């Protein structure tokens, strides 16, 4: 029963924490049976792909931060999707051209990035693995082939996203006679189980090459996207270096661009430091949190993108004198009705290769 699982646990040998009890059981088993943390993480991604299918897996991408017990280096396997070679800067504009409404946009072939998750898993095992992808994918093959009982969150997702599912082959799996599967119903994913078995036998070429690659491509085009078999062939991950900040005697290792998150995770506490946060439910605390967010999120919209393509002013965004400028904009009792991006370029060299454009 899902009811019987912990949200706080302890161990002396090991710890797993994931958003699905069956993925947690699988990762913990790998640790039980003498796997490392990387082995267990790779097993977990495949399990989540089956048991929390609306949230991640081999159709997507991610950022896997790994501290290596051996080397003491922290690195990031960045499996973020790439736009196909056929993508264009105005692909989400209609004929006029203004923006195809979000909720339609989501839903189009042009939205599909070349998936990286599986390439990332292969990379992680190559670097740190002590168990084969064959061993690690097997528990998920069983969950896909044989079923498990859907939890409340997946149940609500199927219900909430019924229209979008309707629309596509996904309906055969999640809507299986025109009705949404309900909490506690068995979800069987025969085709996904077959895809995982192909990966088990042939390796990742089962996904990035031959007959699956052809069908993934054909499908995206049929929905209006440009993705090609060559796009899939071309895909590789990147190894990213964490960006670091000092915080209250700790060091924060976090993810650089193409994540926007790391820079502003570092920037916000630098801005907040001046104000000494520190009653937990006072209006003061929430006010300072909100004002700071307004500033950092404005900088995010102006200055962040893929660093292979654009000059992100990292140095300049987390320069002390820049932090001071931003801190000066924040007042305990009033609110800045007009929060805007600062000018981090004052504090570093070079210049932006991109314009400021309203969205």
């Amino acid at each position: 029963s899902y009811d019987e699982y912990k949200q706080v646990d302890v161990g002396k040998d090991g710890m797993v924490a994931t958003a699905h009890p069956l993925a947690s059981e699988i990762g913990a088993d790998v640790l039980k049976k003498g796997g490392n943390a990387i082995d267990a993480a790779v097993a977990i991604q495949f399990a989540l792909n089956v048991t929390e299918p609306m949230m991640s897996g081999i159709g997507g991408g991610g950022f896997m931060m790994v501290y290596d017990g051996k080397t003491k280096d922290t690195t990031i396997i960045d499996s973020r999707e790439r736009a196909p070679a056929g993508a264009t800067p105005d692909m989400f504009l209609d004929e006029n051209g203004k923006a195809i409404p979000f909720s339609e946009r989501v839903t189009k072939g042009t939205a599909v990035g070349v998936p990286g998750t599986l390439k990332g898993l292969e990379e992680a095992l190559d670097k740190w693995g002590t168990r084969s992808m064959k061993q690690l994918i097997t528990p998920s093959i069983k969950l896909a082939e044989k079923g498990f009982p859907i939890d409340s969150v997946l149940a609500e997702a199927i219900s909430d996203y019924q229209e979008k599912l309707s629309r596509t082959a996904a309906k055969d799996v999640f809507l299986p006679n025109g009705e949404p599967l309900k909490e506690g119903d068995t979800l069987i994913q025969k085709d996904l189980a077959k895809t995982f078995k192909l990966i088990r036998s042939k390796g990742t070429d089962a996904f990035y090459k031959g007959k699956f690659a052809k069908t993934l491509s054909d499908t995206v085009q049929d929905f209006g996207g440009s993705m090609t078999e060559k796009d899939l062939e071309n895909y590789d991950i990147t190894i990213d270096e964490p960006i670091w900040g000092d915080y209250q005697g700790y060091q924060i290792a976090t993810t650089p661009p193409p994540s926007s998150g790391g820079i502003f995770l570092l920037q916000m506490p630098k801005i907040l430091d001046h104000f000494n946060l520190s009653d937990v439910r006072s209006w003061e605390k929430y006010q300072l949190l909100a004002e700071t967010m307004h500033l950092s999120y404005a900088d995010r919209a102006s200055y962040a993108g893929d660093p292979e393509f654009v000059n992100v002013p990292l140095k300049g965004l987390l320069h002390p004198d820049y932090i001071k400028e931003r801190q000066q904009l924040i007042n305990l009792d009033q609110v800045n009705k007009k929060p805007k991006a600062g000018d981090p370029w004052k504090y570093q060299e070079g210049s932006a290769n991109y314009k400021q454009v309203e969205q």
Partner: protein, 175 residues
Amino acid sequence: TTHFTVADRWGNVVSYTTTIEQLFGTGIMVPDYGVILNNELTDFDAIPGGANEVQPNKRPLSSMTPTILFKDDKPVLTVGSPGGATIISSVLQTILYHIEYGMELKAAVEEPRIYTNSMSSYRYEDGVPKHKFGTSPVDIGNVQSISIDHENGTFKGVADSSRNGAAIGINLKRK
């Protein structure tokens, strides 16, 4: 999006955020193969120009923020969360509550959160005590976190109550 984390007996630590973008991505499934396709490219700016404009072979900007905190060169805490633009807010607040307010980890994770990315966009959790905050709360993020105690050689794992998530410690035992 989903976030998970693992720590082992040899000192390896993983913090991993992963996604297909929207719930069910585009909703497109590769026929006969059961793979659901991401809509990740909508994380690009729709109107180009734009640090985060679309370009061929470019990666769209992500708000995923898997993080590890260190003390005296050793990892002591992993933090991450799903939740689109709200992610950094969830990760920041968890760290603030656990470190600055010195709350225990599960309490830090469960402390009601807020998010705002502009004057037109506000969210709060039940109960921040009764700006443009709305009339009803919503859950923000889903933090999975491991803390590591190097002195006792233990681990603590936490899953956020916003989903069904589970922490499972490893405690090897001699009969």
